[PDB]
Design a protein around this ligand. Structure first.
Ligand SMILES: [Hg+2]
Ligand SMILES: [Hg+2]
Ligand SMILES: [Zn+2]
Length: 256
């Protein structure tokens, strides 16, 4: 099935998911000189004090940290959004080398990794219903550069051993996502899509301007994961990123 190799890679996705060549595909290169300052855009409202993480699972293309979204416990509001979006899960995209790994680029610059905090619009009732709407999801994108260690990420780094291969999961309670936010909440926003099949065009992207730094050894542990299931030939989970797509008819707005 789809993956990130030379034979089932992003360049092949269109065959099984024609939307791959759609009008609002993600990710994109953020041209900073062309982005438009929009003064009508409100500050982002991140309310994660009551977040309930549940588990971590290796789904064969990334590792997701899943949260309880049966109530308005960890929500996103404000910015270019309308209403309340509940956090369902967070995951990352990383490279084989520190010079690549992010999906979005800034003036063509690529970061070592990119974090995506996935949220769904509560007037649609469930995640499944949300993906069929134009304003169904909100994804908060955070870049990672290699430098100093990020204290708040080590709990995630330490459990990776436990979910090495596809289909493994581990209890992952009391993880606070607040430890992954940069100091500033300045962002860029545009209408896009999921970056993995089914590539549904139901996402409002919010990409923070300020990256968080992680140590070389923290990113190293990400690179130890496997795309393959247990007892299969080992294939390192590396370069699970989709390259930039054409902006086409869209405008990228800046909150600053
Ligand atoms: Hg997958
Ligand atoms: Hg949609
Ligand atoms: Zn993602």
């Amino acid at each position: 099935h789809w993956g990130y190799g030379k034979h089932n890679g992003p360049e092949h996705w269109h065959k099984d998911f024609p939307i791959a060549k759609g009008e609002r595909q993600s990710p994109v290169d953020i041209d900073t000189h062309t982005a438009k300052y929009d003064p009508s855009l409100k500050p982002l409202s991140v309310s994660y004090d009551q977040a309930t993480s549940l588990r971590i699972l290796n789904n064969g293309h990334a590792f997701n940290v899943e949260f309880d979204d049966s109530q308005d416990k960890a929500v996103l509001k404000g910015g270019p959004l309308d209403g309340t979006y509940r956090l369902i899960q967070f995951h990352f995209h990383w490279g084989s080398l520190d010079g690549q790994g992010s999906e979005h680029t800034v003036d063509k610059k690529k970061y070592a990794a990119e974090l995506h905090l996935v949220h769904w619009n509560t007037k649609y009732g469930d995640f499944g219903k949300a993906v069929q709407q134009p304003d169904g999801l909100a994804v908060l994108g955070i870049f990672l550069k290699v430098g100093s260690a990020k204290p708040g990420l080590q709990k995630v780094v330490d459990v990776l051993d436990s979910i090495k291969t596809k289909g493994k999961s581990a209890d992952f309670t009391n993880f606070d996502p607040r430890g992954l936010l940069p100091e500033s909440l300045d962002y860029w926003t545009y209408p896009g899509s999921l970056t993995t099949p089914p590539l549904l065009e139901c996402v409002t992207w919010i990409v923070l301007k300020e990256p968080i730094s992680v140590s070389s050894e923290q990113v190293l542990k990400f690179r130890k994961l496997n795309f393959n299931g247990e007892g299969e030939p080992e294939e390192l989970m590396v370069d699970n990123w989709r390259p930039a797509q054409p902006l086409k008819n869209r405008q990228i707005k800046a909150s600053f």
